[PDB]
Amino acid sequence: SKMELPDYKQWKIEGTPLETVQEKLAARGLRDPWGRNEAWRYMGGFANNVSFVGALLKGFKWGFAAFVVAVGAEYYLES
Amino acid sequence: MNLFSSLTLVTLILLTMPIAAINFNTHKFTNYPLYVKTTISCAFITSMIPTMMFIHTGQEMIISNWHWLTIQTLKLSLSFKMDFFSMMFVPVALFVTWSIMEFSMWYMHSD
Amino acid sequence: GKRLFIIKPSGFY
Amino acid sequence: SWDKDVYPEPPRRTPAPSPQTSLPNPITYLTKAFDLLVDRPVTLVREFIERQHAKNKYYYYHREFRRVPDITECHEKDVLCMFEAEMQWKRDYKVDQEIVNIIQERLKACQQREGESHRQNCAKELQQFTQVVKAYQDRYHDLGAHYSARKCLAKQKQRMLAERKATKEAA
Amino acid sequence: AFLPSAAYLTHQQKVLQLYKRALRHLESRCVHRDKYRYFACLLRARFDEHKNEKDMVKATQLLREAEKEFWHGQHPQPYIFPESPGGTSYERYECYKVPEWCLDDWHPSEKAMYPDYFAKREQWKKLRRESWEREVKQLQEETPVGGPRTEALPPARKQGDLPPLWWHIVTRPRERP
Amino acid sequence: ITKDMLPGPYPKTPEERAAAAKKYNMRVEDYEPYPDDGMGYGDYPKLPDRSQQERDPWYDWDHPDLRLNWGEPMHWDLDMYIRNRVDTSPTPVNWNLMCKHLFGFVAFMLFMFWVGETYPTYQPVGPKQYPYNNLYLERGGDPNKEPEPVVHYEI
Amino acid sequence: HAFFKAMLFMCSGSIIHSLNDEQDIRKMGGLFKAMPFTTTALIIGSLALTGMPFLTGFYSKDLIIESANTSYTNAWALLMTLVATSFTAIYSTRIIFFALLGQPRFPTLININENNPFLINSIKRLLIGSLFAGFIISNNIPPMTIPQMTMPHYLKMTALTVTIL
Amino acid sequence: MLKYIIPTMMLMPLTWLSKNSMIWINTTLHSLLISLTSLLLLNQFGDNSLNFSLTFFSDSLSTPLLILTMWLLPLMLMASQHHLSKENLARKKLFISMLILLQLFLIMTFTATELIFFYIMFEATLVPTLIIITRWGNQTERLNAGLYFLFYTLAGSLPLLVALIYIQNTMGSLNFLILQYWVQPMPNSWSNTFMWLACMMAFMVKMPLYGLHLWLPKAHVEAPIAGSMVLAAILLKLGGYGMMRITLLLNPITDFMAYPFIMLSLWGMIMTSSICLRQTDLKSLIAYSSVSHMALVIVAILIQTPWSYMGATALMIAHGLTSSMLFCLANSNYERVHSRTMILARGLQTLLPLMAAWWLLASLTNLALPPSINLIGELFVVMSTFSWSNITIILMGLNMVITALYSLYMLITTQRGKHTHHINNILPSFTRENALMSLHMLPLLLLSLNPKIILGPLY
Amino acid sequence: RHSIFAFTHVLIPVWIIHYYLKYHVTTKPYTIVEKKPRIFPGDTILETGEVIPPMKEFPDQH
Amino acid sequence: AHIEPRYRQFPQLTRSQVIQAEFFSATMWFWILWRFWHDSDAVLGHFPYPDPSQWTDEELGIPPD
Amino acid sequence: DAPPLTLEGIKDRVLYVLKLYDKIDPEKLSVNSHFMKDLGLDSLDQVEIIMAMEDEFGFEIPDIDAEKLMCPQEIVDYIADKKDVYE
Amino acid sequence: GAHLARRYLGDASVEPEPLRMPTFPPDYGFPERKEREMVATQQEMNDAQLVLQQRDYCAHYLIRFLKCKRDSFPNFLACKHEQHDWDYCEHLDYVKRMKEFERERRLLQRKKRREQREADMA
Ligand SMILES: CCCCCCCCCCCCCCCCCC(=O)OC[C@H](COP(=O)([O-])OC[C@H](O)COP(=O)([O-])OC[C@H](COC(=O)CCCCCCCCCCCCCCCCC)OC(=O)CCCCCCCCCCCCCCCCC)OC(=O)CCCCCCCCCCCCCCCCC
Ligand SMILES: CCCCCCCCCCCCCCCCCC(=O)OC[C@H](COP(=O)([O-])OCC[N+](C)(C)C)OC(=O)CCCCCCCCCCCCCCCCC
Ligand SMILES: CCCCCCCCCCCCCCCCCC(=O)OC[C@H](COP(=O)([O-])OCC[N+](C)(C)C)OC(=O)CCCCCCCCCCCCCCCCC
Ligand SMILES: CCCCCCCCCCCCCCCCCC(=O)OC[C@H](COP(=O)(O)OCCN)OC(=O)CCCCCCCCCCCCCCCCC
Ligand SMILES: *C(=O)CCCCCCCCCCCCC
């Protein structure tokens, strides 16, 4: 029924690329009024997403561990 | 021979059976999409047997089972070619279609 | 809850 | 069944199963399951129906048309003789159509049966196909939708005049 | 150019429609939100420079070369909202928007399946047919001679009257039927 | 419907043009008929030759799928300018430049396929060698004849 | 191609349904962690499409490029086939970059959910297909030609280098 | 043939002695019994035709036309009983009498052993059709339509009469069975050229030939529904039947007399199909599609090969069923919106889904979807015309593009899109209407199981 | 009635189709034409017992 | 409990979808590394490509004249 | 999928987006705050407010309708009418 | 692919044309050159139903591999050695084709040097 929205005051653009945008706008006498509306996209669980090679190497750690275990298993099983 | 050709035609007749079910209906179905998806998973399983015995021996055949029409020197028959192309494409198409229909039971649920 | 009437043409005939 | 001379098959040579692996193939188990679950009930139902056929046996016959005089020995505009000649010609044309169909069935069965070496091993069926298609073409091609024994006789006489002229000019 | 109430667009309306089209195309060119946000502030600064322009010929000239600016710099595939015209889900559900009058053609065995719904439908139909003559005589006593000038309809003026020509606005199908 | 609301002959006098402009529910200053060259248009208006896709989609149209009001004079080719059919909408690239770029791309690709056909790639190898007189019996050669011996040697 | 391309459309439809019929990649992003199974299967399908070694697209497309290189061929057709091979990698990472990476560009009422067993199992079977089906089919089918397996090192390594570029 | 002629005539006292509430039921019942009886004509032989008497015979060309003719009468009665509900009772019985009389003339048109009796029944069909169009057609233009239908026919058919009587003076007989054995070759001369035109142009008008086709988009459009059903389904095929009989006598001059007409047909099916892309009247679109389909039958009869005659008779039967169903579907929308404008009532699949399925199946058979007998006839004609000249596939294949394009456009305009808002009288489909559609479509689809009975005398 | 699907959609169609193929289709000539089985050197024929002789000894390469 | 929608923040994740996604990513990399360990020649080359310039004229039969 | 909108939810989201706008102080804002007469905003600011509403709720308000939405309550009523809330 | 540049950008008179080569006799430069020995009988690869592309001078390893592949079903990974024997003998055949190409190229170089020496001498 009722959905509780989060607080609006927590969406601050410090620590985000909106801070860099506001700095480069204030360098030429401008100001961005819609930064806190966009601030949720760069905060919370949506901050610090992976890169593209970090996306391709998803599961590489456990895959390499299972690879080493299986290679050692067949190397001990052949003898 | 008798296993190969029978399960070959059972795959196709099995696919035609939910069309006959939906055309001969009176009620609102208890999940006709689940019935079509179960039918196509079963047709995948049934089509894998002639595929396996093609992988074993290279067993190919032609089932020209129903003479339809002879235009003087052109005899047209209901004729099915069970070669390498059919033996690999029919299970791949049935497997893909079985995934597409279990996807469609979710994606088209509001329809 | 909040089931809505679906306007559809007559399927009787 | 059928006659194995009009529809010939070479003798079947299947190889003996020589399994090299220790894994059991599923095809033998599915063959045994098809023999038990499918082939024996179908066989029992067919034996029941065959006993019910054998309780009341009766026969049908292949109709034998005797040979009537053909169109060459019918007088011109004599409808009673040339009617029978035309009916005989239409029956022979329908039978020649089915002879071409038999030879095409032999050719296609050889192409499937011999498989990847079909080109070497089906030369006899290809040669019989070429001979019977040449004969059918010389006999019936280009007659039109309104074909008759008269059109076919006129075509044959034109072909025989061409062959006689070619024999005369080559001697 | 083509509007239901107004006969034209004013200069201020043309400037605002250009500003919205330019921001949407700039967002299509400038996919990321901070990068769009920077260039949208720059575009707002370009629009605020000639905001206090009193010469309407100069303002019309600036609007015209700004439209040429936009036509050179538009995105070939701008973002369209899905239910918006040209969108991928636009007029998708129109095959499900059965009009209400089809319920008049239902069989009594399938009207009996929904007794309270059709009992509540009949008082809507009764309300509509007792409101119709009052709202026709409202329209003809309020439309000037020669016909209506604009396509705007009046509200209800008395307590008890319904607004004239209300039925197909009120009883229109849902967007998700 | 009646006879003086049906289309008629080409309007010649200005009062005939005025009454036929009134018939098609449009202004006299906007009413232009097709030019009287004997093609059979009569007094029917020559509307500006735009597709129905170019109409405002947010307007409350009487026919929303057609983008067409009631009583509005339909274009002569309305069935041609439906949104299922010919679109005349403005394009981001000019029409002549689109034709130049498409024709130049297709012509250049066909020319370069011809060039690469004239100068093909290959590998530094000889021809593939087959036994038994280049597989004479396998290719369908008749066994009563005998071909020339195709002999391949070691290297 | 059937396996990974049907799976790529099913992953796209999972994204489209989670974003309320949104199909434009400029209103996506940040879906690496929000849709983890769709992300995994989309990356596996894009690697199978671009011919990652020993996924299903490797067992056909890499042989196609090796056979097109080492044959009596229209050279412009070969060169355009290789440029198309590089373009496959370009649009595959275009999908992965705008749909999955970066920061969100979709609207603020997040309804992201892929926890239906139908969706998960149907993408899962084509995921097992996109991993292993090229291997299984290419080791089960009989030889019908002679595979060209002798070629120089720049010509054996053409497809992988072009895809990496 | 008299086991069919006498029950068809007994339908006349059956309709005139029936109770006033029973005149549709009784005539429908007993015309369905006559149609069930018509399958005894399938005693066909591989060599001989089924030769009943001196006056009547039936080979495998006339037999499917007879079965279709006797089948179309109950369907015409079902199609016509609703819009003639308010009619005077005696005029209603006169309408049914004109349909019965037209069936009577058709069944002995197709079985007439002798060609001048074929001519008299062939021209006798004009009078009930003219009366049905001009008396029970809906609009003003029916009167003008009745003139065109009357006078393109007779201007073509009165030179045929003379020509046939000339054959009577030359051969001594106009028995088709005698003329099978006494046919003499027709050499190149001017006398034989106008002999060829007099033998062919009446049937060219009946088909219709392109350029002679102008009577049809008035006669089929202005007719009532039973009129349009019998005009498209049967009376066009009098021309094809008559050509297939008369071209026996016209060899070998046909081999160059066919060249203009073949051009008129091969380009004409490109024209009239294209015309269907821009038709605003739905019933006019169905009429022009009939002209386009009969152009193939003209080409197939003129090139006179076995494949072309088999394709032409299959296409005649298939087009009979399909065009009759399409006119009945267009009438089912006309009996709701009272306009034949195709763009008027849109989105009808949202309102009438089972009738939209009938529209779909009739459109699929119109565009010759395999394995329908529409496609069998279409394809066999295309095979024979490719053998005639390989370039014809261009004009054939392009036709099959446009035929698809107007078939689905008709399906997209009427059934799809948004429904028209102001139209609120779209009643649910009556059992009579769906029954009429199924009695067209189910035999049409069942003939794909066994098409050899509609492949004609040289199957 | 827990596995009625495998009875009505599989097993009754396998029964019907095996009856149709065995007693109506294969009783006619050339209706089911099977490719003849591939024979290798070293095989033994079931219909005859004739052992196919093996290949010539290889000029070994590696 | 089904997933409840959130506003301007990262959605609720099930443990099951995370472990399935990680398992199939690990299965992909295990399969790539395993097949690269065992095959290694479908990628890198099966047989050594010989150098035609290193071939002597004696084995090619080139008489020096 | 697709959670249903309420009038209170639409009102909360409209006021939320307007409280995240630096030209509006969130203590003076109410549902009846006229943008030009009470909040002192420009017409360009009103265009940006409607564009943020469009980005918020995921659909387009046309310009003939957007130019007339001059308070939060008119925006809430427009979104209510275009999404059929309180069925 | 340097031979493409030597034929197309350089001179074609010294480069062998692939569609018609060898243009020299096979004994030209070889004292007692031996023939290629075909191991598999023509009837053996007829009965094995090999593709006509596959009935080359190394079809016997293919027949051994196909017999292994039949006899080791369902273990489809159990005939890597027979497959590698067939692949290696196909490799040796391809090396022989490369040797034929290099032989023809060096003989065209010999003809070029011969005609240049004949032009410079006489
Ligand atoms: C001699 C014994 C014969 C027995 C076998 C029967 C042989 C065929 C006869 C004709 C069958 C047509 C009947 C159904 C269609 C018409 C009515 C309808 O739409 O009902 C919908 C309704 C179910 O729908 P609903 O949800 O209730 O409402 C519909 C919705 O409004 C919305 O509807 P919708 O659009 O969602 O659904 C319509 C859908 C729409 O789908 C399509 O339009 C797609 C179809 C085309 C593409 C797919 C097929 C392509 C071709 C392959 C098939 C043929 C060859 C196969 C062989 C292998 C290859 C060679 O159509 C179908 O699903 C129908 C399936 C069969 C289609 C046949 C082909 C029609 C296409 C055009 C012509 C093509 C060539 C001719 C083929 C002839 C084959 C014999 O069906 C019924 O209630 C059926 C009633 C009973 C039908 C009896 C049929 C036989 C009648 C003959 C009586 C005398 C002999 C006794 C036999 C009795 C057997 C029981
Ligand atoms: C659930 C219902 C199934 C049956 C239930 C009751 C029976 C239980 C099981 C026992 C099976 C019945 C007995 C065996 C069946 C009959 C066997 C037999 O000899 O039948 C005679 C024949 C077999 O063929 P035939 O060659 O003997 O005779 C054909 C007739 N002539 C020679 C004149 C051409 O007919 C049939 O079997 C008919 C059924 C065919 C099945 C396929 C239909 C496809 C329809 C497609 C239409 C369009 C095709 C176009 C394309 C064609 C190709 C180009
Ligand atoms: C629908 C509109 C178009 C309809 C076209 C109908 C056909 C067009 C051609 C008709 C020609 C006239 C009838 C020919 C009958 C042939 C019989 C015969 O034996 O002919 C050989 C005979 C030959 O004479 P004979 O046979 O007595 O001579 C003995 C034989 N020889 C020649 C060897 C000595 O031809 C004629 O006598 C004249 C034939 C031509 C007639 C020219 C006059 C009529 C011109 C055409 C009018 C067409 C309709 C006009 C109206 C249009 C609409 C308003
Ligand atoms: C191996 C050889 C390979 C050869 C390759 C090249 C050969 C072919 C060359 C091109 C010919 C075909 C392309 C042109 C016709 C395409 C028609 C079409 O698709 O129209 C689409 C159009 C609207 O589509 P669109 O605007 O994209 O939709 C967006 C949403 N409104 O929709 C409409 O406007 C609807 C129009 C309906 C009527 C169309 C009329 C045109 C019919 C053309 C038939 C051409 C037949 C050619 C026959 C050749 C025979 C060999
Ligand atoms: C000589 O060049 C033989 C090789 C085939 C012709 C040239 C092919 C060029 C493209 C393939 C190599 C690409 C390396 C990135």
CSV table of N, CA and C and ligand atoms in Angstrom, one decimal, chain B residues 65-68 76-78, chain H residues 371 448-449 452, chain I residues 16 19-20 24 28, ligand 2:
chain,number,residue,atom,x,y,z
B,65,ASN,N,5.8,-41.6,-46.7
B,65,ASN,CA,4.8,-42.5,-46.1
B,65,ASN,C,3.4,-42.3,-46.7
B,66,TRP,N,3.0,-41.2,-47.3
B,66,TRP,CA,1.7,-41.0,-47.8
B,66,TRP,C,1.8,-40.4,-49.3
B,67,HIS,N,1.4,-41.2,-50.2
B,67,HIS,CA,1.2,-40.8,-51.6
B,67,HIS,C,0.1,-39.7,-51.6
B,68,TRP,N,0.4,-38.5,-52.0
B,68,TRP,CA,-0.5,-37.4,-52.0
B,68,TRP,C,-1.1,-37.2,-53.4
B,76,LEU,N,4.0,-36.9,-56.0
B,76,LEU,CA,4.2,-36.1,-54.8
B,76,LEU,C,3.8,-36.9,-53.6
B,77,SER,N,4.7,-37.1,-52.7
B,77,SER,CA,4.4,-37.9,-51.5
B,77,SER,C,4.8,-37.0,-50.3
B,78,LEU,N,4.1,-37.3,-49.2
B,78,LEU,CA,4.5,-36.8,-47.9
B,78,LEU,C,5.8,-37.5,-47.5
H,371,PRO,N,-0.5,-25.8,-48.4
H,371,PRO,CA,-0.9,-26.5,-49.6
H,371,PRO,C,-2.3,-26.4,-50.1
H,448,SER,N,-7.5,-29.9,-50.1
H,448,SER,CA,-6.1,-30.1,-50.1
H,448,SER,C,-5.7,-31.5,-49.8
H,449,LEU,N,-6.5,-32.2,-49.0
H,449,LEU,CA,-6.3,-33.6,-48.7
H,449,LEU,C,-6.3,-34.5,-49.9
H,452,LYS,N,-7.0,-34.4,-56.4
H,452,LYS,CA,-7.1,-35.1,-57.7
H,452,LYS,C,-8.4,-35.0,-58.3
I,16,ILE,N,0.4,-46.1,-32.5
I,16,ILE,CA,-0.3,-45.8,-33.7
I,16,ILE,C,0.7,-45.7,-34.9
I,19,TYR,N,2.4,-49.1,-35.8
I,19,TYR,CA,1.4,-49.9,-36.5
I,19,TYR,C,1.3,-49.4,-38.0
I,20,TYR,N,1.2,-48.1,-38.2
I,20,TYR,CA,1.1,-47.5,-39.5
I,20,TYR,C,2.3,-47.7,-40.3
I,24,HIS,N,1.6,-50.7,-43.0
I,24,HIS,CA,1.0,-50.0,-44.1
I,24,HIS,C,2.0,-49.3,-45.0
I,28,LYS,N,4.7,-51.4,-48.6
I,28,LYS,CA,4.8,-50.8,-49.9
I,28,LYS,C,6.2,-50.5,-50.3
M,2,LIG,C1,-5.9,-40.2,-33.4
M,2,LIG,C2,-6.4,-40.6,-34.7
M,2,LIG,C3,-5.5,-41.5,-35.5
M,2,LIG,C4,-6.2,-42.8,-35.9
M,2,LIG,C5,-6.9,-43.5,-34.7
M,2,LIG,C6,-7.6,-44.8,-35.1
M,2,LIG,C7,-6.6,-45.8,-35.7
M,2,LIG,C8,-5.6,-46.3,-34.6
M,2,LIG,C9,-4.2,-46.6,-35.2
M,2,LIG,C10,-4.1,-47.5,-36.4
M,2,LIG,C11,-3.8,-46.7,-37.7
M,2,LIG,C12,-4.9,-46.8,-38.8
M,2,LIG,C13,-4.6,-47.8,-39.8
M,2,LIG,C14,-3.4,-47.4,-40.7
M,2,LIG,C15,-3.6,-46.0,-41.3
M,2,LIG,C16,-4.0,-46.1,-42.8
M,2,LIG,C17,-2.9,-46.7,-43.6
M,2,LIG,C18,-3.2,-46.6,-45.1
M,2,LIG,O1,-2.9,-47.4,-45.9
M,2,LIG,O2,-3.9,-45.5,-45.4
M,2,LIG,C19,-4.2,-45.2,-46.8
M,2,LIG,C20,-3.4,-44.0,-47.2
M,2,LIG,C21,-1.9,-44.2,-47.3
M,2,LIG,O3,-1.4,-43.7,-48.6
M,2,LIG,P1,-1.6,-44.6,-49.9
M,2,LIG,O4,-0.4,-44.4,-50.7
M,2,LIG,O5,-1.9,-46.0,-49.4
M,2,LIG,O6,-2.9,-44.0,-50.6
M,2,LIG,C22,-3.0,-42.7,-50.9
M,2,LIG,C23,-4.1,-42.7,-52.0
M,2,LIG,N1,-3.7,-42.6,-53.4
M,2,LIG,C24,-2.9,-43.8,-53.8
M,2,LIG,C25,-5.0,-42.6,-54.3
M,2,LIG,C26,-3.0,-41.3,-53.6
M,2,LIG,O7,-3.9,-42.8,-46.6
M,2,LIG,C27,-3.6,-42.4,-45.4
M,2,LIG,O8,-3.0,-43.0,-44.6
M,2,LIG,C28,-4.0,-41.0,-45.1
M,2,LIG,C29,-3.4,-40.3,-43.9
M,2,LIG,C30,-2.1,-39.5,-44.2
M,2,LIG,C31,-1.5,-38.9,-43.0
M,2,LIG,C32,-0.8,-37.6,-43.3
M,2,LIG,C33,-1.8,-36.5,-43.7
M,2,LIG,C34,-1.2,-35.1,-44.0
M,2,LIG,C35,-2.2,-34.1,-44.6
M,2,LIG,C36,-1.6,-33.0,-45.4
M,2,LIG,C37,-2.5,-32.4,-46.5
M,2,LIG,C38,-1.7,-31.7,-47.6
M,2,LIG,C39,-0.5,-32.4,-48.1
M,2,LIG,C40,0.3,-31.7,-49.2
M,2,LIG,C41,1.7,-32.1,-49.3
M,2,LIG,C42,2.0,-33.5,-49.6
M,2,LIG,C43,3.4,-33.8,-49.9
M,2,LIG,C44,4.0,-33.0,-51.1
